[PDB]
Amino acid sequence: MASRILLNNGAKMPILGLGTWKSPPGQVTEAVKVAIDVGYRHIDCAHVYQNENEVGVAIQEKLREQVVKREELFIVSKLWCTYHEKGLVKGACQKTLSDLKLDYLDLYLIHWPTGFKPGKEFFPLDESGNVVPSDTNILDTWAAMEELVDEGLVKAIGISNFNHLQVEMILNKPGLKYKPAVNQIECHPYLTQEKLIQYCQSKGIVVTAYSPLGSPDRPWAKPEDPSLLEDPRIKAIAAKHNKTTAQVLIRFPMQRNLVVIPKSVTPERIAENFKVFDFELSSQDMTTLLSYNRNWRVCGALSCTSHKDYPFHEEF
Numbered sequence: 426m427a428s429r430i431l432l433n434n435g436a437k438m439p440i441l442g443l444g445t446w447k448s449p450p451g452q453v454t455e456a457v458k459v460a461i462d463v464g465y466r467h468i469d470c471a472h473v474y475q476n477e478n479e480v481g482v483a484i485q486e487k488l489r490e491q492v493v494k495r496e497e498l499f500i501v502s503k504l505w506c507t508y509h510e511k512g513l514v515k516g517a518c519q520k521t522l523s524d525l526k527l528d529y530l531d532l533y534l535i536h537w538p539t540g541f542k543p544g545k546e547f548f549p550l551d552e553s554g555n556v557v558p559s560d561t562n563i564l565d566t567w568a569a570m571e572e573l574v575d576e577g578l579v580k581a582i583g584i585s586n587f588n589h590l591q592v593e594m595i596l597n598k599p600g601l602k603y604k605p606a607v608n609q610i611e612c613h614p615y616l617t618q619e620k621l622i623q624y625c626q627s628k629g630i631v632v633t634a635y636s637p638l639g640s641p642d643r644p645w646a647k648p649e650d651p652s653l654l655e656d657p658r659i660k661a662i663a664a665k666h667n668k669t670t671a672q673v674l675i676r677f678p679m680q681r682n683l684v685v686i687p688k689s690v691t692p693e694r695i696a697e698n699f700k701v702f703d704f705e706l707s708s709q710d711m712t713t714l715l716s717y718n719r720n721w722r723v724c725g726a727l728s729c730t731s732h733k734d735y736p737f738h739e740e741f
């Protein structure tokens with residue numbers, strides 16, 4: 426298992442990264458410092474997570490300490506839904522760069538295919554609770570992303586939570602200049618994503634698996650929801666390999682040629698989650714884990730279900 430995967434922009438992306446959604450601002454600086462100290466070279470960020478300033482403090486300190494060089498890091502962020510308009514994309518990217526204290530991103534993603542009305546609120550609502558869309562379309566937002574490459578702000582551009590017809594819309598865009606390098610999607614044994622993964626990989630688009638542990642800290646969790654980390658069948662596979670359940674859940678996407686971005690703020694877990702390059706799941710293990718699919722989504726975008734670009738009506 427090599428540590429990096431080749432993207433269709435010619436750059437190499439570390440297959441293991443640190444997630445930062447829900448990482449409290451008063452803990453994420455230490456989390457990222459520890460991660461870099463124990464070998465992580467890829468951090469997954471987003472403006473909407475409201476902690477990029479604190480992530481940036483950690484990155485900058487480790488660069489200043491010469492623990493790593495900038496070229497060895499792979500920093501990812503995402504354009505939030507209220508910035509899909511042509512005239513807002515550059516400023517949104519620049520705010521993320523300023524907060525992360527970087528002069529380029531390795532990868533910048535359209536966070537969701539749905540554009541929302543610009544303004545201070547990340548989820549602008551009408552008086553009856555529906556998200557207010559913007560009349561921007563995917564293709565014009567993509568052209569704005571391409572301009573970021575040509576201005577030197579980002580090395581690669583990609584998409585997140587795009588279904589296969591939305592990916593196809595970009596691939597078929599008139600005048601397409603840069604293909605998406607990555608589609609970042611939810612993926613784990615309860616949402617195995619075979620169809621969308623095969624489609625993206627067949628087009629040379631690398632898939633990143635988010636919520637690989639089932640996001641046990643997601644704010645809308647209910648006690649009755651399935652729990653990957655507690656699933657006795659997954660625990661049994663981990664026991665057989667003398668690894669933790671989380672380690673199996675991280676190794677699983679790696680062996681499907683995916684990038685994976687588990688989140689933790691706990692130093693011991695940050696280190697544990699990186700120790701996944703020393704064992705192999707068998708083909709039988711892989712097929713058994715795939716068999717647990719139940720089309721269960723952590724991130725269903727349930728308040729956007731009437732948006733014209735809502736991604737999860739299509740089968741994939």
Ligand SMILES: NC(=O)c1ccc[n+]([C@@H]2O[C@H](COP(=O)([O-])OP(=O)(O)OC[C@H]3O[C@@H](n4cnc5c(N)ncnc54)[C@H](OP(=O)(O)O)[C@@H]3O)[C@@H](O)[C@H]2O)c1
Nearest residue numbers: 444445446635636637638639640642671687688689690691
């Ligand atoms: N593009 C998108 O729309 C999108 C959506 C969702 C997520 N993401 C990205 O993907 C990242 C990962 O997904 P996620 O944050 O939803 O959840 P996740 O990585 O599946 O799970 C994170 C949770 O697992 C716990 N955990 C981590 N390592 C563990 C271990 N070894 N043993 C036991 N528990 C462990 C963490 O606890 P502690 O932190 O307390 O240790 C935290 O509660 C996000 O942070 C974000 O960067 C992107």
